[model samples]
Target: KETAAAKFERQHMDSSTSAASSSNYCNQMMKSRNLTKDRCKPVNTFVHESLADVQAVCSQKNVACKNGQTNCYQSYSTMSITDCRETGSSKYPNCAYKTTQANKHIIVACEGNPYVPVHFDASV
Candidate 1:
């Protein structure tokens, strides 16, 4: 029998793979729809279970580079990391959940936001 963590890993990996593939497909699809137009890159992004998780994961993974194009500040309870890049590049490189903090809930707050609220439960 597979453990719950194993199951989650499988699910998460599968979902991630599927999402990436879908993005690629869509990008190609759009270009195919109009060959005369340049093959543009899709507007891709990372998706975490919650805002707190996003901040935590981004912090842990070095996803947010200080003053980098890809680095960004997210809203409260909403963890969002961003960087500017040409298409065909990984949206969230070096991204991995923090094992030590797994299942631990934390509050996410943006720079301008006040009052950090308990947000994502770090299960991943």
Candidate 2:
């Protein structure tokens, strides 16, 4: 099963690379990760941090998710991140993106016994 945790990894985690990414990064990554296959994800974020560190968010102080769920948590430290925005030239099967980088706290919704992030709710 492509669990929610796995979906979070495929959609956001990119720890090995620096957030100092190129313009073509989101275009290539979005395609390679299969995020563009079904439909273009209008806005997406990539985290330049370890999976373990991200998972630990499950234990952080509880916060509300964007949808009002109380299963979300905010990171204590600012992390490297990239915001990928779809370009005007984008279309299905040919998704285009403009990459922007930043350092900020992360907010994620978690679940399960060995709690892990299931959704990227927001950043603050």
> What would the per-residue lDDT of candidate 2 be over residues 1-124, giving only the tens digit for each residue?
7888899999989988977467788888888888899999898898999999989888887888878999999998888988888999999878899987899899999999888999987766
lDDT of 1 at 90: 29
Estimate candidate 1's alpha-carbon lDDT, on a 0 to 1 scale. 0.29
Superposition error at 78 for model 2 (Å):
0.4
Q: Cα lDDT of all candidates, in order?
A: 0.29, 0.88
TM-score of each: 0.23, 0.95
- Candidate whose TM-score is highest: 2
Provide backbone clash counts, one per model.
5, 0
lDDT of 1 by residue, 83-110 (tens): 1123444233321221111222222212
RMSD of each: 14.7, 1.0
Candidate 1 Cα errors over 4 Å, as ranges:
1-18, 23-44, 55-65, 68-109, 115-124
Look at candidate 2 and give me any clashing residue pairs. Answer: none
Clashes of 1: 5
